[PDB]
Design a protein around this ligand. Structure first.
Ligand code: FES
Ligand code: FES
Ligand code: FES
Ligand SMILES: [Fe+2]
Ligand SMILES: [Fe+2]
Ligand SMILES: [Fe+2]
Ligand SMILES: [Fe+2]
Lengths: 178, 425, 424, 177, 177, 425
């Protein structure tokens, strides 16, 4: 998948997928959550495994697996409920709202198995500031499957795996989206 | 702090809490000695370390420990600190080992924490008795899958420590002959609040869920009950009876149905000797003092680990009946992470509240007047035939007053003999 | 700390300051009790919350407060803390509300911070007198648009606390019958230094501005006589140049300098202040109202310093203009203040750099083991100046500063306001 | 940026990304004269104060046009700042801070006049100074860039910095975003 | 990079970015044998010590050629670092740290020889280890990349890391920039 | 802390160290007064500031100082603090200064730290004697190129402070009549551990290098006899292998190892040291001059540890070379030291990881409740060795470490140098 170096892609494709991520970041950072949730595919799997500190010979166990506890591991129904909460005036974690920034780079694209689909690796810094002085800085990789669509966004998010560069979460909550 | 000065910080007669209990560094350090140093604390579940050599790290206060399965089935808990110069013996969170070697000077340990060799022992350590120089060992006892540890030889055993609270623990832990198991994976995160807010809330506070804290959580998933305060020991639990609304909103229709109708729930009623206990309890919260908390039904369980007075870590995992269908285990997995986790639609808000309370307590005037803990004062029944202990309506701070009173007792007792002398006749 | 030991940390007779007053944690806890707990503290300006239900948060020391306009015109200040389990009643900076509800267990408050309902009160809280369980209320008094608060019932009223310092405040606040207003917007930033550096600087320290601190700021604004007031009692101070517009021109530019010194608005100021010197010939002024209210009449930046332990503060600053100033003048004040006396301003950029370095050096043992020199202008005073009340020095002096640190001693060694009145 | 920007020619995307990468180098390597030369005669360099609001009042999140701000400068005001920062007596920046302007998420929309472009981009600004001081900032920059005949290819006609802070977590703002 | 780089072909910009993005993956996923194989036999991997100077002495800001450095390594030295980091007795990286190399601001200029490119880029390196350790770095990397016949497309012939720190705000530098 | 309470924290007779010496904040404040306030502390090397006006900053504890070459060739060290309101006088790390001006109110100083002018002096400071209002001056003395400073006029002079330890320093500093010079460049980094771990390790701990700490560092570069010096008084210590080049070749490579043991430079070293063993058969040496000056003769890294509270230090390191070594050997020393004993070095990478974990574990109450084992080599000493002065032990011992912690007790329990000198034998 990203086992060997991705073949070169058309500059058109690189730019199209990059613009998709930059627009997605704008939706999240500007709290356009209705439009963000509309980017999610009906078959969305939104996954953020728990990461542990291991010695070398046991690094296969670094991430939680498929039937194991996780930070996020959601289908569309679960995510729809999260949208209902984060657009709510009695949602105390996000009212008042956090100020977030999603700085996206290192976009690498590989043709998926079905036409119109793409495997994408990219990296992020998420900077989250709230209330008076609270500041959490996150980084990680996002491994996505994007699927081309006729929405103004132009893709939908079929699959996301967030690989967070933290073991213990250095934040009191994870009340936003990666 | 003198003993009599600490006792004045809590008043279960009038219902008053001095907010300095959540901020004072001297009290905090005394809590590490007198509470965490001699209480039974949750280490996890037996099924997290099933095989010989399986280990996981954990905390007893701010002491890091190794929880390790031995060759004879035994579970040992020992300080994760080499006695030579203090190096962490193992830096991984978990795995399987045949031994542990200190990376600093190579003192080597078996899986039981015994020091078994020291490099150049013959020339440089002629007299050394290795059997006296291994890391401190905690007492380890289980209760129905849960592992607890306690450093203190003179503490009561786990069964006595839990006492009558076992009854309320069994609603989660004794519903089937198969027992429970932990779903693998432990979520760990950092909240800048005092441990006692968390401990209290899971001990006593259905009020917050029944009012405003979780309106948004309820929406994301779209009156009667009782509360138990331990006769002694600071444990508490509360639960709704008959009304599925909070349970359905938290855990969805599949889990709700598994918890209340059909063979598994009927088995629960049989084992617990009551249809009410097995099938009509809906959303229960519980704390085993000081820092083990869980929600029977939802089936999240966690240890709170103190990080000074202004910070905790939450270490959470989910347990399921070992004989539940695979589809039910998967539903428990997703619905718990969806709700009672760092990013969960309930627990997201639990920790925003705690964080703001603690930051406000920076203020001098914010620490200068007591908090109101008078809710349900004198509205108790210590002679309920179905429910042992001191029983209140589900909306009350009786269990909370019990937790803060146990806090006073531990904080003002130089040893367990003195603490045993505060027990009722 | 014993009272006599605190008194030895400041010596206004020979002019010495012990640097541990800026670092000691125990002294800091006692400041929150004996200074911030019973002084009048700046909450803002009336025109920031003009309508019923308008609120803004602020701080009294490290106690967060709500400042709220009531239906009867009243301004209430109360602790932003629910007495149930301590939750912050309101988590926004400002807005307009008809009530406030605690998010934790739903205890509900009117806009005055009275507790008016508690969910499930009848069953669970039978004997509850809600009127005794609302958050602590501060006393509130205004002075020509400024809002101050004070927790202590036994403190003097605002008018008496300010005293003769009112004279010097009036240079900014009483230039017209229409009063002042706040330009909307409050800048907040964090400086790791002790509050007393900032308070003293605005109390007493024209020297820093007349020497090296702001050479670069003065340069950015381009192509000797003055006095300093020390309050007889109370720790207030103010200084200003007389006659020479070079610092004012360099900071605020030609349009503001002309408005401040010439034409109908300045002549009206001269009339209301009974002096052409006061109205038209005062040329950049600095002032502190003890402990932490500071402002620069003419520039018209005003701020509260909020302590955050001995090693940190927040600055919450905004700008005031005459309400009847032309719109072009209000705009010019807006732009010039932000250009100069703000986190990124060409003056205050440098004040923040100095203070941060002082505080870091004070980690050192030897750095804390010898006194700072506070002897500037010792004995060169006149407390019977016919035109200016108080103790009057040349503009370059530390007389006002000595006064500030002496008031610190007095408050720090008085168990209540009766003991503090005995030092008058 | 109310609606998703239409696709643009790769050459345009690359050209304006290069303008920002070059601008960042000038700032990060203290080439301030060259940086100030990017600014148009009609520059409005604006950084509103951001506040924490509940949902129903988030239209008041940012200070407005006749309200106080962190920056709200024209060409004359910016020229004064250039004088300061190139001064041996400018203490906040002598010694100079070490900055890094990591720029990403560049989205471009044609302006209403030819030769002009509306641009949204995001940043991390890392500012380290003296021994151990470290301030990390993030935000959006909403620009109007205008074509010129200069080597740089554009001038900065307008910038609005939307900072992801309410209270500023720095003792000053002595550098440029 | 004395003057603003001329425009380059979009395909060159894209392949060099892809070089760095792939490099970042190799480092962040601990594919260290593959990373070291990117280095040319004439590799000079250099990270000078950076000091706080007044304006008139900013030429002394970075440690020079015959001066102490954080890194200043040839192929043989780097080969030894690979040998340390792929053993199971290397305690600083066993257990392994988690790193993220966020790369941006890529600017390319033709080198003096055909097949060689001068590249400036910036980074945030985010390094988290054990339970709660967090070190965040930023800086510039100035590289010479050289065309090769490998899958990777280039080899790294020279790297100078310019770090935005004076005192290093980390207990070690046990990874690669 | 009472003096007798402090003395009980360390026991050189039985070999015990109470871990609270590494964590307690009250003890730390007393270390700044009674250790860092009156010890000789490393400022650097004379060749770092060769010309009039040349300066570099440094620390004495947490007091920032300026180290400045004077017009007459002397070196001054003075507090980097204006006595007016405490502003740091110079914010640059080093360079060549004409003079210094306080940025706050413009008080001006010459390069000797003398206050030479004060704006508006005539009108606002009529009495002021500027010669009395300059920053505190430290004593400054050198030993074979190394600059040390000490605030306390009652301390012994540097020669006496070093005493018999000079012998062991000379292995690095006295190999040639040309003396040493510093390679330009000082690496500074931050390690969250107590200073005593670092000072101890370089004083006494060849054991960590001969066991597991540096297996990986050794492998990246591709031992039985030796002795350890413990100072009769003063807390200094040094150890080294004799005969076997294996630790030296793995660290520094064959060119340096050859330069150190064979040929004209090494033979000259043996002559000046009066011994072939001292000059040519000494292989990897470690040393600390108490409290916080450490170096490795042969490798030729040298550093100061700067305390940053009990839970943090800074390391400020540089490399020294023989001033007459060929240019290629100077280059080899530069590359090999930065390769090995630096923040990113293949040896020291691992030292910083160990110390950090020790300190973090010590947050724990039980982790601080029992002594560390410091019995290695107890009683296996020779205080009458003919070729090596002081108290000599096998290379694997903690005798020097016991000496270091005994000196710590002596300083910490002495109100002044008179009381300290009275602890001498
Ligand atoms: S610290 Fe464990 S062997 Fe030395
Ligand atoms: S904390 Fe406010 S209602 Fe409970
Ligand atoms: S602090 Fe140095 S002159 Fe004032
Ligand atoms: Fe809750
Ligand atoms: Fe100033
Ligand atoms: Fe591109
Ligand atoms: Fe080592």
């Amino acid at each position: 998948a990203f086992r060997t170096k991705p073949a070169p892609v058309d500059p058109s494709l690189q730019h199209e997928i990059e613009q998709f991520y930059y627009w997605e970041a704008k939706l999240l950072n500007d709290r356009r959550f209705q439009e963000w949730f509309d980017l999610l595919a009906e078959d969305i799997h939104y996954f953020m495994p728990i990461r542990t500190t291991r010695i070398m010979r046991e690094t296969a166990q670094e991430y939680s697996g498929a039937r194991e506890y996780a930070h996020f591991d959601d289908n569309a129904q679960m995510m729809r409920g999260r949208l209902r909460k984060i657009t709510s005036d009695v949602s105390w974690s996000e009212n008042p709202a956090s100020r977030t920034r999603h700085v996206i780079s290192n976009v690498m694209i590989v043709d998926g198995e079905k036409p119109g689909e793409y495997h994408v690796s990219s990296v992020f810094i998420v900077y989250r500031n709230r209330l008076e002085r609270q500041l959490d800085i996150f980084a990680g990789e996002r491994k996505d499957i994007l699927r081309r669509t006729g929405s103004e966004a132009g893709f939908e998010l079929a699959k996301r795996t967030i690989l967070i560069d933290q073991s213990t979460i250095l934040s009191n909550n994870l009340s936003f989206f990666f | 702090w003198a003993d009599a000065d600490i006792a004045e910080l809590v008043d279960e007669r009038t219902g008053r809490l001095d907010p300095r209990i959540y901020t004072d560094e001297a009290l905090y350090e005394q809590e590490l000695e007198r509470i965490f140093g001699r209480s039974w604390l949750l280490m996890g579940h037996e099924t997290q370390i099933p095989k010989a050599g399986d280990f996981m790290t954990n905390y007893m206060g701010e002491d890091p420990v190794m929880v390790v399965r031995q060759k004879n089935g035994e579970i040992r808990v020992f300080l994760n600190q080499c006695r030579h110069r203090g190096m962490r013996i193992c830096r991984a969170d978990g795995g399987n080992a045949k031994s542990f070697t200190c990376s600093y000077h190579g003192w080597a340990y078996d899986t039981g924490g015994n020091l078994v060799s020291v490099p150049f022992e013959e020339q440089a350590f002629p007299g050394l008795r290795k059997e006296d120089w291994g890391p401190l060992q905690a007492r380890v006892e289980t209760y129905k899958g849960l592992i607890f540890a306690n450093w203190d030889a003179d503490a009561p055993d786990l069964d006595t420590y839990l006492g009558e609270a076992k009854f309320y623990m069994d609603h989660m832990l004794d519903r089937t002959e198969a027992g429970t198991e932990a779903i693998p994976g432990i979520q760990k995160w950092v909240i800048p609040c005092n441990w006692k807010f968390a401990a209290e809330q899971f001990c006593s506070d259905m009020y917050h869920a029944g009012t405003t804290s979780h309106l948004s959580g309820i929406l994301a998933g779209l009156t009667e009950g009782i509360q138990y305060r331990a006769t002694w020991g600071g444990h508490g639990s509360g639960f709704y009876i008959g009304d599925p609304n909070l349970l359905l909103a938290i855990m969805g229709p599949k889990v709700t149905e598994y918890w209340t109708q059909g063979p598994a729930a009927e088995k629960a009623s049989e084992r617990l000797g009551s249809t009410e206990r097995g099938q009509q309890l809906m959303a229960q919260h519980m704390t085993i003092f000081p820092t083990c908390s869980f929600l029977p039904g939802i089936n999240t369980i966690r240890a709170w680990h103190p990080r000074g007075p202004n910070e905790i870590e939450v270490w959470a995992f989910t347990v399921v009946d070992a004989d539940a269908p695979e589809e039910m285990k998967e539903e428990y997995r997703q619905q718990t992470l969806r709700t009672f986790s760092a990013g969960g639609v309930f627990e997201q808000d639990d920790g925003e509240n705690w964080v703001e309370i603690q930051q406000v307590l920076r203020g001098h005037k914010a620490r200068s007047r007591p908090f109101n803990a008078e809710m349900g004062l004198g509205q108790t029944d210590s002679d309920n035939p179905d429910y042992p202990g001191t029983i209140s309506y589900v909306y009350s701070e009786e269990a909370a007053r019990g937790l803060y009173t146990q806090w006073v007792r531990m904080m003002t007792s130089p040893d367990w003999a003195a603490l045993d002398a505060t027990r009722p006749a």
